Coordinates of C-alpha atoms (C1' of nucleotides) in Angstrom, one line a residue:
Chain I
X1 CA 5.7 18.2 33.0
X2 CA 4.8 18.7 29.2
X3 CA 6.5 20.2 26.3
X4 CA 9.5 20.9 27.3
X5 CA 10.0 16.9 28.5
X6 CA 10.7 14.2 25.7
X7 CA 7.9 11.7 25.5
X8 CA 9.7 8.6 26.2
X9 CA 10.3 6.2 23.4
X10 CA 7.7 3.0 24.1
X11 CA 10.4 0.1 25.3
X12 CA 8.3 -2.7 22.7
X13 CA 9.7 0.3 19.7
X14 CA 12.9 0.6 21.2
X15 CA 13.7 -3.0 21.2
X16 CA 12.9 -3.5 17.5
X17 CA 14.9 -0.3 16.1
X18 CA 18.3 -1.2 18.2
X19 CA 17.4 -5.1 16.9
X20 CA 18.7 -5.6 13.3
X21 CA 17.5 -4.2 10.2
X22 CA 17.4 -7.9 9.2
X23 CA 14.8 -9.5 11.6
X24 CA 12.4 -6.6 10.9
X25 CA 12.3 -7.7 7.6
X26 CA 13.2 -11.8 7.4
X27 CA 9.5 -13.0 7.3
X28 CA 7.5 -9.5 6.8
X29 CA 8.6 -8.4 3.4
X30 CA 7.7 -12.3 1.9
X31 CA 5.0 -12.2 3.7
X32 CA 3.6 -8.7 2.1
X33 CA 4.9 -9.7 -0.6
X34 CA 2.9 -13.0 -1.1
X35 CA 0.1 -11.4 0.2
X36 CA -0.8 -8.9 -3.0
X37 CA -2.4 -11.6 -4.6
X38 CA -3.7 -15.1 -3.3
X39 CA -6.6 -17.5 -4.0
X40 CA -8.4 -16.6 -1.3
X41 CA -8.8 -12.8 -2.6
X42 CA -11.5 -14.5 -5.3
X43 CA -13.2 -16.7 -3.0
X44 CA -14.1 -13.2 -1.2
X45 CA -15.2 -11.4 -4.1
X46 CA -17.3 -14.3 -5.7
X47 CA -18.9 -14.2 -2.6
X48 CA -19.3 -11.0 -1.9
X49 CA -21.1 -10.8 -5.4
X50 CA -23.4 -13.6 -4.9
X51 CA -24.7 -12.1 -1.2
X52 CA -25.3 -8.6 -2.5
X53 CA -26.7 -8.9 -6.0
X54 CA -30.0 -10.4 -5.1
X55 CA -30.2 -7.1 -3.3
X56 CA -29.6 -5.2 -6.2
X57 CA -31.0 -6.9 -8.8
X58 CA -30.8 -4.6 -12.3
X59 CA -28.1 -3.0 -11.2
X60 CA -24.6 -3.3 -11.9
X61 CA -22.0 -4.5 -9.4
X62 CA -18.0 -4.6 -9.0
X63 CA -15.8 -5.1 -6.6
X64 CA -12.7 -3.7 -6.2
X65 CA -10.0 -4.9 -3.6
X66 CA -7.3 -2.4 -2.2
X67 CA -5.5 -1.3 0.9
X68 CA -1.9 -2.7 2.7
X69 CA -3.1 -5.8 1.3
X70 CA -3.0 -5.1 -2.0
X71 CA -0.1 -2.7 -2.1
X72 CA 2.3 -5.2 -0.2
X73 CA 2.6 -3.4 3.1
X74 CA 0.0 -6.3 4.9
X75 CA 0.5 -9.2 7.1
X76 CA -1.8 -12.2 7.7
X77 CA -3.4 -10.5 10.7
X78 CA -4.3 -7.2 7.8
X79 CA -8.1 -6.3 6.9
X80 CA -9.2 -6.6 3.3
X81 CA -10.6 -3.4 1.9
X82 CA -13.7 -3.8 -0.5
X83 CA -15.0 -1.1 -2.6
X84 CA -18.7 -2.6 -3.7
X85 CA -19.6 -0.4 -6.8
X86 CA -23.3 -0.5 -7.2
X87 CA -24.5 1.4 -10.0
X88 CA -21.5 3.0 -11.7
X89 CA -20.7 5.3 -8.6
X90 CA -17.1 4.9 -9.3
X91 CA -16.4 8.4 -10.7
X92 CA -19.0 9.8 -8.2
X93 CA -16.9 11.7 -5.2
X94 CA -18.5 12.4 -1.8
X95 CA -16.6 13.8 1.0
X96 CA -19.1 12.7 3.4
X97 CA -21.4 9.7 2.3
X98 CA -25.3 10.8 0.6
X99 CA -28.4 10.0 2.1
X100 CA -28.6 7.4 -1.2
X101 CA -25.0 5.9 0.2
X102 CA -26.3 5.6 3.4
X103 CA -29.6 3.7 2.3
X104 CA -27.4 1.1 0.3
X105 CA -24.6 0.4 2.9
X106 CA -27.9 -0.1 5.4
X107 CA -29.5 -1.9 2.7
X108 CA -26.1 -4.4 2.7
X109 CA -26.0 -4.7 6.5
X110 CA -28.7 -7.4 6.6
X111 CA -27.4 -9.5 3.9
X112 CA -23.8 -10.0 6.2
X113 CA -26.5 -10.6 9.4
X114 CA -28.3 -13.3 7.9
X115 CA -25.5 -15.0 5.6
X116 CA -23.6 -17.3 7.4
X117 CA -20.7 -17.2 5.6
X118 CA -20.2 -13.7 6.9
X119 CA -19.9 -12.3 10.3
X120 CA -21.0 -8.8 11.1
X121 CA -18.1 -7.1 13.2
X122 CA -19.4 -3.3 13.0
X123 CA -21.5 -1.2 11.1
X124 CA -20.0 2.5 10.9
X125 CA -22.8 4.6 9.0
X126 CA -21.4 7.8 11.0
X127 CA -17.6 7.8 9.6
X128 CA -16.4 10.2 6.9
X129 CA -16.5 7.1 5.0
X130 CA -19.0 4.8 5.9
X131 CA -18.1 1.1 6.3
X132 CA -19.2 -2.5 7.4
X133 CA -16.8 -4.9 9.5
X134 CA -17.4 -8.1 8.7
X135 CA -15.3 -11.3 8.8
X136 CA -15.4 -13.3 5.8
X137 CA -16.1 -16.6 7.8
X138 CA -14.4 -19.2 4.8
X139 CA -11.3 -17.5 5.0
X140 CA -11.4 -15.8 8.5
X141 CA -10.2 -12.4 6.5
X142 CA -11.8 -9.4 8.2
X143 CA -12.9 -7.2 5.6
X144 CA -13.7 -3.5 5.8
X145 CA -16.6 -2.6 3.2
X146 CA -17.2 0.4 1.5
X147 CA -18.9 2.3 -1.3
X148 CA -16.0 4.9 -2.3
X149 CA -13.5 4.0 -5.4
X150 CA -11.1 6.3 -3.9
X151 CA -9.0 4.2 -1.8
X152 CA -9.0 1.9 -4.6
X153 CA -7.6 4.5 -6.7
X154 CA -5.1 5.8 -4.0
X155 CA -4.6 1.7 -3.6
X156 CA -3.4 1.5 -7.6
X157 CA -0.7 4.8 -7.1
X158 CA 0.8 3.1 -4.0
X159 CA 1.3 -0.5 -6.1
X160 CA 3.1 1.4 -8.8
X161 CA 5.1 3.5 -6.5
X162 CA 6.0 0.3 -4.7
X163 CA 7.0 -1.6 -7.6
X164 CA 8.9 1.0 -9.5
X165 CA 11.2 1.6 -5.9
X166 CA 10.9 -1.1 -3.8
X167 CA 12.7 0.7 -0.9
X168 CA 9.1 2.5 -0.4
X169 CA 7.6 -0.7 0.4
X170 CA 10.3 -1.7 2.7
X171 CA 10.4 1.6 4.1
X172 CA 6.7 1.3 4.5
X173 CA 6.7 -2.2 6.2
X174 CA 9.0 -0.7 9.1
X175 CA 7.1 2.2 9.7
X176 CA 3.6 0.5 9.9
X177 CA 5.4 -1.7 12.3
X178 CA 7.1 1.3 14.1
X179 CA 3.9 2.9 14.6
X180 CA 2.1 0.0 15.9
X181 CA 5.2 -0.8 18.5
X182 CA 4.7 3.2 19.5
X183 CA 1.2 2.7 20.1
X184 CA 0.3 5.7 17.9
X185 CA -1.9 4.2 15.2
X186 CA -4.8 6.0 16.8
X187 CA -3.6 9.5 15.4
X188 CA -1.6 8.4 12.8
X189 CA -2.8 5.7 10.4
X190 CA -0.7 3.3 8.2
X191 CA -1.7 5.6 4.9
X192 CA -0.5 8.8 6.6
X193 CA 2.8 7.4 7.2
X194 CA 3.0 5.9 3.7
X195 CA 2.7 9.6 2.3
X196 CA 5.4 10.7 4.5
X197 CA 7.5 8.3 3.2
X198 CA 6.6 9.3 -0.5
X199 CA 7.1 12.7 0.1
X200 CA 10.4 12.1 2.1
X201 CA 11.6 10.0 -0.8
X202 CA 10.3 12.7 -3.7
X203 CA 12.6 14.9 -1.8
X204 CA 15.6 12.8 -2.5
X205 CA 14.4 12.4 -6.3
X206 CA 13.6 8.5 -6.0
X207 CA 9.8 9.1 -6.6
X208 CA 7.8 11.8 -9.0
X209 CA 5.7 14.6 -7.8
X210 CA 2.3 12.9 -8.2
X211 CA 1.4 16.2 -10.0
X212 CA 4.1 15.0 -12.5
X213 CA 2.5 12.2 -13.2
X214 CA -1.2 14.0 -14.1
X215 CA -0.3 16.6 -16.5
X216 CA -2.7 17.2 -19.0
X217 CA -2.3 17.5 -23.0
X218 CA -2.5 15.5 -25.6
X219 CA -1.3 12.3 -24.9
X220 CA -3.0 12.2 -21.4
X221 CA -6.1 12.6 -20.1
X222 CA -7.7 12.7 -16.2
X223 CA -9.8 9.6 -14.9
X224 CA -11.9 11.8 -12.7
X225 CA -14.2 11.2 -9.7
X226 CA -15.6 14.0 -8.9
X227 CA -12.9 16.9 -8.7
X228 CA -10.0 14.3 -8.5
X229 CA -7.7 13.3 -11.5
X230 CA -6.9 9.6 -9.9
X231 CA -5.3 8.1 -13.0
X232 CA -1.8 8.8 -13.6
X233 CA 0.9 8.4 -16.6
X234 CA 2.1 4.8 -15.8
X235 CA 5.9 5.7 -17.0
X236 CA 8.7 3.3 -16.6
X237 CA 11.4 5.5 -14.2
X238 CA 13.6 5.0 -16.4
X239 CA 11.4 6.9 -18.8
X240 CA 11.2 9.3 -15.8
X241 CA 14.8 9.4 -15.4
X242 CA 14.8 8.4 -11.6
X243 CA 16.9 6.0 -10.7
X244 CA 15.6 2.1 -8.7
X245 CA 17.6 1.1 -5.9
X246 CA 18.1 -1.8 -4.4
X247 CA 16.5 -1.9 -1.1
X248 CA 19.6 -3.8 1.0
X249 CA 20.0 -3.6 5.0
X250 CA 22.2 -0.8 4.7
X251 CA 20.5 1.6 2.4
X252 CA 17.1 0.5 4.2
X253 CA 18.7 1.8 7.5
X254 CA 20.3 4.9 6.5
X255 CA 16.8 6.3 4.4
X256 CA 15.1 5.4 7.7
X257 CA 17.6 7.6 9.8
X258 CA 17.0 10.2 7.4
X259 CA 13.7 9.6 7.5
X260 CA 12.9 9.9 10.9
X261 CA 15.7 12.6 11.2
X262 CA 13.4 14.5 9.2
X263 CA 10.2 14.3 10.3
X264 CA 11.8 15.0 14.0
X265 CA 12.7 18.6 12.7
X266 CA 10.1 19.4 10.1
X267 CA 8.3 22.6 11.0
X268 CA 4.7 21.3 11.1
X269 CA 3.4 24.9 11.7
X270 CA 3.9 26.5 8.3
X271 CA 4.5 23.6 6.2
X272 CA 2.9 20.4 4.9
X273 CA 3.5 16.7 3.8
X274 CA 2.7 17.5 0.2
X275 CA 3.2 14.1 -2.5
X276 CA 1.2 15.9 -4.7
X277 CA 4.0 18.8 -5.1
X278 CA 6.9 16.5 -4.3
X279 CA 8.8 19.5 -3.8
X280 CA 10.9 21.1 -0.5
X281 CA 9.1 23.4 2.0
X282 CA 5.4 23.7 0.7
X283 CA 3.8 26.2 2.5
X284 CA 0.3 25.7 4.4
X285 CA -0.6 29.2 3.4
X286 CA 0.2 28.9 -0.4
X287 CA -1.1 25.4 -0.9
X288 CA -4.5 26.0 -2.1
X289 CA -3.5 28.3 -4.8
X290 CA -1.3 25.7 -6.4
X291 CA -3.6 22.7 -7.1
X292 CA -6.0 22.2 -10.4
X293 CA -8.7 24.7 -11.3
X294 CA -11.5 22.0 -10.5
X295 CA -10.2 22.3 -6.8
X296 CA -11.5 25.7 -6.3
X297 CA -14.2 25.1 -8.8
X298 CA -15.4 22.2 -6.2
X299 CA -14.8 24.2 -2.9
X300 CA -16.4 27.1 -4.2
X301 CA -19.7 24.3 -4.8
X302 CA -19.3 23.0 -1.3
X303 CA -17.3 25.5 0.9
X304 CA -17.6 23.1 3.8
X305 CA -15.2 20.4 2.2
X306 CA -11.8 22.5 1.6
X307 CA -8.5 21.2 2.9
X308 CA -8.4 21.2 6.6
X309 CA -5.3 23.3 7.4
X310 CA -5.8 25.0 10.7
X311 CA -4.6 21.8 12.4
X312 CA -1.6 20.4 14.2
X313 CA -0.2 18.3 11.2
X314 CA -1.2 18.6 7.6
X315 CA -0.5 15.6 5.2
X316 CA -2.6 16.1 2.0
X317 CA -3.5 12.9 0.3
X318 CA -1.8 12.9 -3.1
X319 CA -5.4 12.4 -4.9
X320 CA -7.9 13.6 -2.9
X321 CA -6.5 16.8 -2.5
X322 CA -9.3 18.2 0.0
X323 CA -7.8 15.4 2.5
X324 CA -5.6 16.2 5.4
X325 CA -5.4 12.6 6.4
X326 CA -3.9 13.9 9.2
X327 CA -6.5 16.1 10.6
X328 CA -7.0 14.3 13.7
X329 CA -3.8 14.5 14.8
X330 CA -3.8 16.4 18.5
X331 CA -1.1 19.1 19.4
X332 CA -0.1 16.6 21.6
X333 CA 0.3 13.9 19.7
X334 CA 2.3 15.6 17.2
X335 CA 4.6 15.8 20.1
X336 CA 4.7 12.2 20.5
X337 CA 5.5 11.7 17.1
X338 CA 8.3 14.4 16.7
X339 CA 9.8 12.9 19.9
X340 CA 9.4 9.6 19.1
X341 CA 11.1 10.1 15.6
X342 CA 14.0 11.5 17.2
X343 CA 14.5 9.1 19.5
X344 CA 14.7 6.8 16.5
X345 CA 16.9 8.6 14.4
X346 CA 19.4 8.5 17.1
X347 CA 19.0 4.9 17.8
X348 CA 19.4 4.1 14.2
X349 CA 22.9 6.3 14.2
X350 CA 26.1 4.9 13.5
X351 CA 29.0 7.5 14.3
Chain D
rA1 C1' -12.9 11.4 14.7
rG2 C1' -13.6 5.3 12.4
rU3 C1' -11.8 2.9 4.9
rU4 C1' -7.5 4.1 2.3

RNA sequence: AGUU
């Protein structure tokens, strides 16, 4: 008994959605809030820079905090996300980590081993991104540690996004939690969802196309790394000419019914969550004719790293344009999903 | 498949 049965809304999801907007949000949103910036942040980075640059002496070294975190989505239980830039790699892209990545996050492993101040959870030398787990021991922060800016810069669109329409944040909060209480954070991550709700609010014209954003002339110039433009005009919305909300109960629930409304009926087989567009109905089999020239310059360099669209659910990071973030999303959990998101939008009716 |  598959497709043609509803996957049952998970009771610990069900209980939260038909509980008020309010108690979602009483202690999270201070909490993310709060939780951009604190002392604790520099105690992490001051050490992080003392460990490693013994082990790269003569060589340059930054680091750069991002993820929920640092856009305002986290809670005290939330990894830290380090970019450790070694070298002025920042504007260096790889889709999959070099050999000479590889050799420096091994090189770092041994410093987090032998430091007590540091606890080695995991080293991950196989993902797409390499990391290192470790628990930064003053603090008891679990930090994930990498050696590619573009989270960072992906990090630094969100925090503008978030600022200039609040509702996104809130929005993003209750769908993080959502997709914990759903158990579905294995196929779809925190960032996935936070596209979809960019895209979804785009749509309504309360955020820009990203592309918007990146056009270049005179005035404006791309940051590049690699292929990817990651800066972006920094325009007030009023400027923009979209208009800020404010994020109350009511107009929190009723974008949330939308929003699940709509991802419970969008047609995942011919179209794509696109923030980049920010535009209605973009089409799987037109995308890759409508981003920058240096896209197809890059695939045509390394044909092996082009968008991966022959999958269940496509949602192309905004930046990274080669990224289906959701790529590993299974025919069957796209199910899950679309069935779950129903189940919420009509929980979260009021006739 | 593992950060975002």
């Amino acid at each position: 008994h598959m497709q043609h049965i509803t996957v049952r809304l998970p009771k610990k999801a069900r209980a939260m959605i038909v509980g008020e907007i309010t108690n979602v949000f009483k202690d999270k949103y201070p909490i993310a809030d709060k939780l951009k910036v604190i002392p604790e942040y520099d105690v992490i980075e001051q050490d992080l820079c003392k460990l490693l640059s013994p082990g790269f002496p003569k060589q340059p070294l930054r680091v750069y905090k991002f993820g929920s975190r640092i856009t305002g989505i986290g809670n005290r239980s939330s990894d830290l996300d380090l970019f450790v830039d070694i070298g002025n790699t920042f504007h260096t892209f790889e889709h999959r980590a070099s050999n000479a990545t590889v050799a420096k996050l091994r090189a770092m492993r041994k410093f987090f081993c032998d430091s007590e101040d540091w606890r080695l959870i995991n080293f991950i030398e196989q993902a797409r991104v390499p990391i290192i787990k470790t628990c930064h021991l003053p603090t008891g922060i679990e930090c994930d540690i990498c050696l590619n800016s573009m989270g960072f810069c992906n990090t630094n669109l969100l925090k503008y996004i978030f600022e200039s329409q609040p509702l996104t944040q809130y929005m993003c909060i209750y769908v993080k939690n959502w997709l914990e209480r759903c158990k579905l954070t294995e196929q779809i991550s925190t960032y996935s969802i936070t596209l979809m709700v960019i895209y979804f609010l785009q749509l309504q014209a309360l955020l820009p196309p990203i592309a918007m954003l990146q056009i270049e002339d005179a005035a404006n110039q791309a940051v590049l790394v690699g292929p990817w433009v990651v800066n972006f005009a920094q325009k007030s919305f009023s400027e923009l000419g979209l208009q800020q909300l404010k994020a109350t109960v009511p107009v929190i629930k009723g974008f949330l019914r939308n929003f699940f409304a709509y991802f419970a009926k969008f047609d995942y087989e011919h179209f794509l969550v696109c923030p980049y567009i920010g535009q209605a109905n973009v089409e799987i089999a037109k995308i890759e004719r409508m981003l920058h020239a240096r896209y197809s310059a890059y695939v045509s360099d390394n044909p092996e790293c082009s968008i991966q669209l022959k999958k269940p659910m496509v949602v192309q990071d905004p930046i990274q344009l080669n990224h289906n973030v959701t790529k590993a999303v299974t025919k069957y959990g796209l199910q899950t999903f679309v069935d779950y998101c129903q189940q919420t939008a009509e929980l979260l009716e009021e006739p």
